[PDB]
């Protein structure tokens, strides 16, 4: 038995955020029926295909454990089918624009009338009631809207986007929390709920630490752990040392440690030609002696200039650069193991190639080979939560309208009605 | 009614990942009892305080809607107290080191004997069964382990950490999904489960899109939407040109679209002296005519060199630089407003200062002013999921051991025993 066995999900979602949510629900046992536009369907199907006339990897990696029906929802017949489907659903999920589901004929008030137990779940750009509730938002726009871009990158570069989907997949996971929370409401009340996640808000939630930093900056005028607060560290375009004298909003700190121990991203052997030949190295106070041992600077063990956190505050970047010189002829895994034998936590930058072929990730079900007999097998990311009672059974993504007639039969339609719907181009 | 009304959480968590999970459960109505170390408590209390001997903003922004008890869990009396608390709990949450809770005497097996209904939830660094399962992992190392660092930043710079807590807060939110899924299944089985999220896996889930790219790269040798696909655009530090001829693992693409739909980070008025004076601008293929009107380039609408994704691959960055010239005398808000007239996906890089003081975010309850008459009021991030039937009631973070005696009384202890435990320094 899996957690969402028996949960019927009516899934209107397309692209990334909504589809990630309903896929993960599918991995935990949900019965997900993906409603798609006739002819073309989810636009990710035709997005950067590696095989001619085959659904893309963008589509397959976000739409496993789902069935597909085609439907023209602007038809009277299409709306009637929708009503029948809503009556059999536990959860409806959508990411249409602001007011779009209302405009296609399905307000929250009407949905409740159709099914007093259904949960309506929406992904939005900005929250309902926001001044900017009307704006379109995509992945990187949300990263910008939510404070991540402003605080990611370097002090002498632009605002920078994360390769991680802070906007789309993250908002999807947030909506899954909302949906699951609404299921627990329903166990208590016996009735459904409307739930919504704004992409800005899902981003902001992960940037909570930078809102801590903004308040600290306003209250005290300084962030002591940031590069800009330390001598001989950060400089601008024209070589002047930076400082918090003139900084009133949380700045970019490059690869600085932040809310943890002071750290930096250090080059290992081959960095000129291997973009991922790096480790992240941290200087914990109470490791200082074993660091001195590792890098053979015994003189630094006794010297008050280097001996303490206070002493190192004017030379931390120079200390990182020196440690880096010791990694110049060593590989990133070599350095990690070297650090470990001194009790020093250190970690390599994993390339996507390394991750795609790592045996450990495949052993634990985090990287999974999906059996796809139509398209050829592909890798995906599985469930990042591991459970004592079960594991996901990941099955291939659906062809466009693959399950249209099968779903119609489940609604109770006979052959005659089904053929008429095809005739009238409703499905 | 609140989703987690009547749910009792025994909360061992400290620092960021675990506390974020339990705070958000508290926001949704859970009764959270936070077990803390005697004297010092959660180490975030004393980290980067903005006011002497006042619990830090790191602590207060991660520990609202919790009660605090001090406990020496090493003592025989402390352990039997834990036994009584476990029998009353629905969820136990921990982020101690590998095997630490086991070695305290509280294996999953023993926990099941104490309470068949209780759910055990853990934050780990690497998944159980992983080669690295024994390692402790911190924020930026987790970002490196999960593919985020490798795919974030620029092609001529280093792997770059995100300002977003992709390791800590992200893992906590994923753990919350795991906990709620376990509650949902307990309604069917009547039994608790063990659930775990690893930091590497939480990061990898958000980097799903980069695993698509790796497979595309291995299969085809080209990622056509990446900057390096534009001939003679990207170079390394030595001025050597970059292209997919010699790229075998997913590279950093600067401010490229990722999950979009191509886009870039474009300067607005004041960029020279304002780090966040930028917008993100997306060239969605279906909106090229609208874009041409906005930037007064009608000749680009019918030109095969400009009017498709394929035509623009060799010149996309030249188009971005031209669009940017149109924003030279407009601030980011006026540019966003202008683009929105055309329906073009485009928005500002919001500064943390701007987010901290934004009226819209406070209206919708995503930025919340917490009433704290002991410490003074502070801002925090509220629930990023909004519900039709309830709103969170956020209450100030507990003082160290504030609720110790209160919690002991609930366990049925008399005043004599409570006095004895204080005298023995168990509490």
Number of domains into which chain A is organized: 2
What are the backbone angles phi and psi of residue A34, rounded to the nearest 5°?
-85, 115
Cβ atoms of B346 and B339 closer than 8 Å: yes
Say whether B205 and A152 touch across the interface (CB within 8 A).
no
Minimal CA–CA distance to B150: which of A167, A356, A257?
A: A356
What are the backbone angles phi and psi of residue B368, rounded to the nearest 5°?
-125, 130
* A115, B35, B79, B105 from B100: Cα distances, Å: 48, 15, 14, 9
Instruction: For residues A368 and A378, give the distance between their C-alpha atoms in angstroms, rounded to a whole number.
Output: 8
Cβ atoms of A256 and A234 closer than 8 Å: no
Environment class of residue B105 by beta-carbon count within 10 Å: exposed (0-12), middle (13-18) or buried (19+)? exposed
Using only the alpha carbons of chain B, give its radius of gyration.
Answer: 26
Say how many C-beta atoms besides its own lie within 10 A of residue B60's C-beta.
Answer: 23
Which of A350, A378, A408 is the endpoint of a domain? A350
Cβ atoms of A236 and A156 closer than 8 Å: yes
Cβ atoms of B379 and B60 closer than 8 Å: no
Say how many C-beta atoms besides its own lie within 10 A of residue A76's C-beta.
Answer: 9
User: Is there a single domain that holds both residue A291 and residue A412?
Assistant: no
Instruction: For residues B296 and A26, give the distance between their C-alpha atoms in angstroms, rounded to a whole number.
Output: 47
Q: Give me the half-sphere count of Cα atoms (radius 13 Å) on the Cβ side of residue A15.
A: 20
What was the experiment behind these coordinates?
X-ray
* Residue A327 touches chain B, beta carbons under 8 Å: no
Instruction: For residues A122 and B295, give the distance between their C-alpha atoms in angstroms, rounded to a whole number.
Output: 33
Of B177, B193, B215, the CB nearest to A57: B215
Say how many C-beta atoms besides its own lie within 10 A of residue B363's C-beta.
Answer: 13
Most A CBs within 10 A among B52, B127, B161, B254, hence the mutation to make, goes to B161
User: Is there a single domain that holds both residue A213 and residue A85?
Assistant: yes
User: Is there a single domain that holds both residue A264 and residue A391?
Assistant: no
What are the backbone angles phi and psi of residue B33, rounded to the nearest 5°?
-105, 110
Say whether B353 and A137 touch across the interface (CB within 8 A).
no
Of A141, A255, A282, the CB nearest to B138: A282
* Residue A135 touches chain B, beta carbons under 8 Å: yes
Residues of A in Cβ contact (< 8 Å) with B205: 169, 173, 381, 384
Token pair in block for residue A99: 């007011």
With DSSP H G I counted as helix, E B as strand and the rest as coil, what are the percentages for chain B, rounded to 5? Answer: 40, 15, 50
Instruction: For residues A20 and A62, give the distance between their C-alpha atoms in angstroms, rounded to a whole number.
Output: 6
Please list, residue by residue across B304-322, b when 16 or more beta carbons sit within 10 angstroms of its beta carbon and e when fewer do: eebbeeeebeeebbebbee
Instruction: For residues A420 and A417, give the distance between their C-alpha atoms in angstroms, rounded to a whole number.
Output: 5
Q: What is the CATH number of the domain that holds A207?
A: 3.40.50.10540
Of A141, A361, A380, the CB nearest to B347: A141
H or E stretch covering A281: strand A278-282
Minimal CA–CA distance to B125: which of B108, B148, B146, B104?
A: B146
Instruction: For residues A247 and A250, give the distance between their C-alpha atoms in angstroms, rounded to a whole number.
Output: 7
Which of B350, B385, B414 is the endpoint of a domain? B350
What are the backbone angles phi and psi of residue A70, rounded to the nearest 5°?
-85, 140
Handedness of CA A263, A268, A271, A276 (dihedral sign): negative
User: Is there a single domain that holds both residue B83 and residue B40?
Assistant: yes
CA distance B418 to chain A (A): 35
Token pair in block for residue A380: 């995906």
Strands (E), A95-174: 119-124
Token pair in block for residue A92: 């409806």
Instruction: For residues B266 and B324, give the distance between their C-alpha atoms in angstroms, rounded to a whole number.
Output: 6
User: Is there a single domain that holds both residue A346 and residue A400?
Assistant: no
H or E stretch covering B94: strand B91-94
* Residue B22 touches chain A, beta carbons under 8 Å: no
Instruction: For residues B264 and A154, give the distance between their C-alpha atoms in angstroms, rounded to a whole number.
Output: 17
Environment class of residue B234 by beta-carbon count within 10 Å: exposed (0-12), middle (13-18) or buried (19+)? buried
User: Is there a single domain that holds both residue A152 and residue A208?
Assistant: yes
What are the backbone angles phi and psi of residue A355, rounded to the nearest 5°?
-70, -40
In sequence order, the 6+-apart residues with CB closer than 8 A to the CB of A393 are none
Instruction: For residues A126 and B336, give the distance between their C-alpha atoms in angstroms, rounded to a whole number.
Output: 14
Token pair in block for residue B202: 């939480």
Instruction: For residues A4 and B359, give the distance between their C-alpha atoms in angstroms, rounded to a whole number.
Output: 38
Nearest 10 degrees: CA dihedral of B125, B128, B134, B138?
A: 0
Q: Give every strand in the sheet of A193-198, ordered side by side.
A: A67-70, A31-36, A8-11, A91-94, A119-124, A193-198, B385-387
Minimal CA–CA distance to B27: which of B397, B398, B394, B399?
A: B394
H or E stretch covering B217: helix B208-220
Instruction: For residues B284 and A208, give the distance between their C-alpha atoms in angstroms, rounded to a whole number.
Output: 31
CA-nearest residue to B340 within chain A is A135
Say how many C-beta atoms besides its own lie within 10 A of residue A319's C-beta.
Answer: 18
* Residue B366 touches chain A, beta carbons under 8 Å: yes
In sequence order, the 6+-apart residues with CB closer than 8 A to the CB of B377 are B369, B370, B371
Say whether B258 and A148 touch across the interface (CB within 8 A).
no
Please list, residue by residue across A157-173, b when 16 or more beta carbons sit within 10 angstroms of its beta carbon and e when fewer do: bbbbbbbbbbbbbbbbb
Say whether B265 and A158 touch across the interface (CB within 8 A).
yes
- For tokens 């160290």, the residue is B400
Q: What is the CATH number of the domain that holds A302?
A: 3.30.1540.10
User: Is there a single domain that holds both residue B175 and residue B94?
Assistant: yes
First-residue to last-residue Cα distance in chain A: 33
Instruction: For residues B177 and B24, give the distance between their C-alpha atoms in angstroms, rounded to a whole number.
Output: 11
Residues of B in Cβ contact (< 8 Å) with A188: 1, 5-6
Instruction: For residues A175 and B253, give the distance between their C-alpha atoms in angstroms, rounded to a whole number.
Output: 28
- Nominal resolution in Å? 2.0
Cβ atoms of A116 and A217 closer than 8 Å: no
* A162, B140, B166 from B161: Cα distances, Å: 8, 6, 9
Instruction: For residues A155 and A143, give the distance between their C-alpha atoms in angstroms, rounded to a whole number.
Output: 18
Which residues of A carry out catalysis? 168
Of B206, B267, B356, the CB nearest to A170: B206
**Per-position DSSP letters for B325-337, written without gaps between them:** HTTTTS-HHHHHH
**Per-position DSSP letters for B158-199, written without gaps between them:** -----SS-TTHHHHHHHHHHHHHHHHHHHHHHS---EEEEEH
Per the structure, the complete domain to which residue A292 belongs is given by 254-350
Token pair in block for residue B237: 């530090």
Say how many C-beta atoms besides its own lie within 10 A of residue A422's C-beta.
Answer: 13
Handedness of CA B29, B35, B40, B44 (dihedral sign): negative
Task: Provide the 3-class DSSP secondary structure of residue A189.
Answer: helix
Token pair in block for residue B412: 């049925």
CA distance A303 to chain B (A): 26
CA distance B36 to chain A (A): 20
Instruction: For residues A296 and A298, give the distance between their C-alpha atoms in angstroms, rounded to a whole number.
Output: 6
In sequence order, the 6+-apart residues with CB closer than 8 A to the CB of B136 are A345, B97, B98, B125
Nearest 10 degrees: CA dihedral of B28, B33, B39, B41?
A: -40
**Per-position DSSP letters for A48-89, written without gaps between them:** S-SSTTS--HHHHTT-SS-EEEE--TTSHHHHHHHHHHHHH-
Question: How many residues comprise chain B?
Answer: 427
- For tokens 């010699």, the residue is B246
User: Is there a single domain that holds both residue A88 and residue A187?
Assistant: yes
User: Is there a single domain that holds both residue A343 and residue A361?
Assistant: no
**Per-position DSSP letters for A339-392, written without gaps between them:** HHTTT--EEE---HHHHHT-HHHHHTTSEEEE--TTT--EEEE--SEEESS---
Minimal CA–CA distance to A247: which of B277, B274, B164?
A: B274
How many inter-chain contacts (A to B, CB under 8 Å) are there? 534
Do the bridges between strand B91-94 and strand B367-370 make them parallel or antiparallel, or are there none, so unpaired? unpaired
Indicate the DSSP class of residue A246: G
Minimal CA–CA distance to B316: which of B231, B425, B398, B411?
A: B231
Instruction: For residues A204 and A207, give the distance between their C-alpha atoms in angstroms, rounded to a whole number.
Output: 5
Token pair in block for residue A359: 């045996």
Residues of B in Cβ contact (< 8 Å) with A205: 169, 173, 381, 384
The region, left, alpha or beta by phi > 0 then psi within -120 to 50, assigned to residue B175 is alpha
Minimal CA–CA distance to A33: which of A71, A69, A4?
A: A69
User: Is there a single domain that holds both residue A115 and residue A264?
Assistant: no
Token pair in block for residue A358: 């790592």
Minimal CA–CA distance to A293: which of A345, A344, A327, A348?
A: A344
Residues of B in Cβ contact (< 8 Å) with A44: none
CA distance B291 to chain A (A): 15
Which of B321, B350, B379 is the endpoint of a domain? B350
Rounded to 10°, the helix A199-206/A168-189 angle is 100
Say whether A165 and B200 touch across the interface (CB within 8 A).
no
Q: Give every strand in the sheet of A385-387, ordered side by side.
A: A385-387, B194-198, B119-124, B91-94, B8-11, B31-36, B67-70
In sequence order, the 6+-apart residues with CB closer than 8 A to the CB of A103 are none
Which residues of B carry out catalysis? 168
Interface of A with B in 194-253 (CB under 8 A): 194-198, 200-216, 218-220, 224-225, 248-252
The region, left, alpha or beta by phi > 0 then psi within -120 to 50, assigned to residue B221 is left
Minimal CA–CA distance to B381: which of B96, B52, B16, B1?
A: B16
Question: How many residues comprise chain A?
Answer: 427
* Residue B376 touches chain A, beta carbons under 8 Å: no
* Residue A141 touches chain B, beta carbons under 8 Å: yes
User: Is there a single domain that holds both residue A282 and residue A355?
Assistant: no
Say whether B349 and A149 touch across the interface (CB within 8 A).
yes
Environment class of residue A197 by beta-carbon count within 10 Å: exposed (0-12), middle (13-18) or buried (19+)? buried
User: Is there a single domain that holds both residue B178 and residue B123?
Assistant: yes
Environment class of residue B152 by beta-carbon count within 10 Å: exposed (0-12), middle (13-18) or buried (19+)? buried
């Amino acid at each position: 038995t899996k957690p969402l066995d028996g949960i019927n999900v009516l899934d209107f979602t397309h692209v990334q955020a909504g589809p990630a949510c309903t896929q993960m629900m599918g991995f935990l046992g949900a019965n997900v029926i993906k409603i798609e536009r006739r002819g073309s369907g989810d636009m990710t199907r035709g997005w950067l295909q590696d095989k001619p006339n085959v659904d893309s990897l963008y589509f397959t990696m976000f739409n496993c454990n789902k069935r597909s029906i085609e439907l023209d929802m602007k038809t009277p017949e299409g709306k009637e089918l929708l009503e029948q489907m809503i009556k059999k659903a536990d959860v409806m999920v959508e990411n249409f624009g602001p007011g779009a589901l209302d405009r296609m004929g399905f307000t929250w008030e009407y949905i409740q009338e159709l099914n007093p137990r259904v949960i309506l779940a929406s992904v939005k750009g900005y929250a309902e009631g926001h001044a900017n509730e009307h704006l379109k938002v995509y992945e990187n726009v949300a990263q910008c809207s939510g404070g991540a871009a402003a605080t990611t990158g370097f002090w002498d570069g632009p605002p920078t986007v994360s390769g991680a989907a802070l906007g789309d997949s993250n908002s999807g996971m947030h909506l899954m929390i909302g949906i699951l929370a609404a299921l627990e409401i329903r166990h208590k009340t016996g009735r459904g709920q409307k739930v919504a996640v704004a992409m800005q808000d899902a981003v902001l939630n992960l940037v909570r630490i930078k809102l801590r930093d903004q308040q600290r900056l306003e209250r005290t005028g300084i962030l002591a752990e940031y590069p800009q607060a330390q001598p001989n560290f950060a400089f601008d375009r024209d070589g002047n040392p930076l400082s918090f004298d003139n900084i009133t909003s949380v700045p970019r700190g490059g690869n600085a440690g932040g809310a943890g121990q002071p750290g930096w991203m250090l080059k290992c052997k081959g960095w000129e030609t291997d973009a991922d030949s790096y480790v992240y190295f941290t200087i914990a106070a109470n490791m200082w002696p074993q660091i001195c041992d590792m890098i053979d600077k015994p003189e630094w063990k006794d010297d008050p200039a280097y001996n303490t956190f206070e002493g190192r505050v004017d030379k931390l970047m120079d200390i990182f650069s020196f440690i880096e010189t010791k990694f110049a002829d060593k590989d990133k895994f070599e350095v990690t193991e070297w650090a470990a034998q001194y009790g020093i936590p250190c970690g390599p930058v994993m390339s996507m190639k390394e991750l795609a072929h790592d045996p450990s990730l495949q052993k634990v079900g985090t990287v999974v080979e999906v059996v796809d007999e139509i398209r050829g097998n592909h890798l995906t990311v599985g469930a990042p939560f591991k459970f004592s009672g079960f594991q996901p059974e990941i099955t291939r993504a659906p062809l466009l309208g693959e399950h249209t007639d099968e779903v119609l039969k489940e609604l109770g339609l006979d052959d005659a009605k089904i053929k008429e719907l095809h005739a009238k181009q409703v499905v």
